[PDB]
Ligand binder design. Structure first.
Ligand code: UYU
Ligand code: UYU
Lengths: 237, 10, 237, 10
């Protein structure tokens, strides 16, 4: 069985996630509406709102607050698009092969994302990633542990206190691995599967940074982004 | 630099 | 009577304005919706869209295109909020004392603007300005001439070719003054009235820059602005 | 600097 320290970590992570992911999606009506690069305004707002949520989630991870502000920014700039891809799995549906956020207005199929300036070189692996992650049938606990582990990866450009963050991510990996053993029947191969998805996210991050570069180099498109998106996905150090 | 990120992070 | 050169200038300005002001206001549905600082997202989009329109208007003013890009930026940064205040008179209604843009969703009373972070120190003079300008009952020709004259003011911080722009604004003032004499019955005092409104706009510009400074110094608010708003109302040279 | 304004102005 798991210890109290590990149990408190799971509780903190679940609560943090319930505090920052609204299953009702009612805030989506405040975004610039979708149009079917007609979808860029709506998806820019969607991602902008999602980044604020990830920041809120990160601040409630045990020990993340105790990092320097530079390390927190470092981690968030490298990992934000990855956490968004992970957290979005919760709206992803295998039936529709789309992200369904509580209404046909906010049902995003792949072709919607084409009209925000992305190509299949990103959307193909993205959707296969969502499919595979959805098939893992992760417990809520496992889902939130993976986001925290992804966020707390020391192997990011810009990180200062490599030792401290690797310790944090070590703790979470131990929690996850113990959780999968005790609470997840038939979980013998699950941890390795989850670690592989982390590797998949690195390649999706790379392809996304590529396509974001092309858009942000055209002011008529980058002007449709939000200030927070420009800050987080931008290249400043 | 990182004006918004520093806020938000409190 | 007026000459052909002056007549062509009036025609060019009217056409430019008809090309950049949509009386149907149908684009407003694409803005983040209004909420009744709940109105900041919607009004930020409104102003952002209006700035693009003013740029489009400026580019069709005779001779503005022939300025250096620095002078064009100089003029636009100083004068954008003034042209917006002028051009908005076309949606302003004396009956409602509001700006009515083709629907109750896009009817902006003063209290809406309070919920975007402004105080009566701006909204009081703004609305009195709209009232007085509306009472002048300007001809379309006179309305567009005043916007071009306001845009082409050499007395702006940053302007390089003071002589060239003053010549341009001289030409337009001559056109306006001749137009008011020949085509506007009872226009004997109109030119002076219009020149005074230009002075009124300087003070509204000043009060607005003040209140924009306070908002933009709080990232939780400035993050709701658009990139174009931040560029134009910002202080870079 | 003035990235968007320079575009737009063509
Ligand atoms: C945001 C989430 C959700 C749906 C994420 C999806 C759907 C649309 C396309 C999305 C945004 C992908 C796009 C390539 C990212 C577009 C970025 C930009 C600025 C436009 N260039 C990355 C995640 C994809 C909905 C919900 O679960 C919340 C959760 O945070
Ligand atoms: C924009 C126009 C119109 C309505 C302008 C009005 C109405 C609302 C309050 C407005 C925007 C005033 C506010 C003090 C400006 C708010 C700026 C910001 C970013 C939010 N801090 C300046 C003009 C005012 C509608 C139409 O005629 C188009 C035309 O360009």
């Amino acid at each position: 069985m798991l210890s109290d320290e590990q149990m408190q970590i799971i509780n903190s992570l679940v609560e943090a996630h319930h505090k920052t992911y609204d299953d009702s999606y009612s805030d989506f009506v405040r975004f610039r509406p979708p149009v079917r690069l007609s979808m860029l305004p709506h998806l820019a707002d969607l991602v902008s709102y999602s980044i604020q949520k990830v920041i809120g989630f990160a601040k409630m991870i045990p020990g993340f607050r105790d990092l320097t502000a530079e390390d927190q920014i470092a981690l968030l700039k490298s990992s934000a698009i990855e956490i968004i891809m992970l957290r979005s799995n919760q709206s992803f549906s295998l039936e529709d092969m789309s992200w369904s956020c509580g209404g046909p207005d906010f049902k995003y199929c792949i072709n919607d994302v084409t009209k925000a300036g992305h190509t299949l070189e990103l959307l193909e692996p993205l959707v296969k990633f969502q499919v595979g992650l959805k098939k893992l049938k992760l417990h809520e606990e496992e889902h939130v542990l993976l986001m925290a582990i992804c966020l707390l990866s020391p192997d990011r450009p810009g990180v200062q206190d490599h030792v401290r963050i690797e310790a944090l991510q070590d703790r979470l990996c131990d929690v996850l691995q113990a959780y999968i053993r005790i609470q997840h029947p038939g979980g013998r191969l699950l941890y390795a599967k989850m670690i592989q998805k982390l590797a998949d996210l690195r390649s999706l991050n790379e392809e996304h940074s590529k396509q974001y570069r092309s858009l942000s180099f055209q002011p008529e498109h980058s002007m449709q982004l939000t200030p927070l998106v420009l800050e987080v996905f931008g290249s400043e150090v | 630099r990182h004006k918004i990120l520093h806020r938000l992070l409190q």
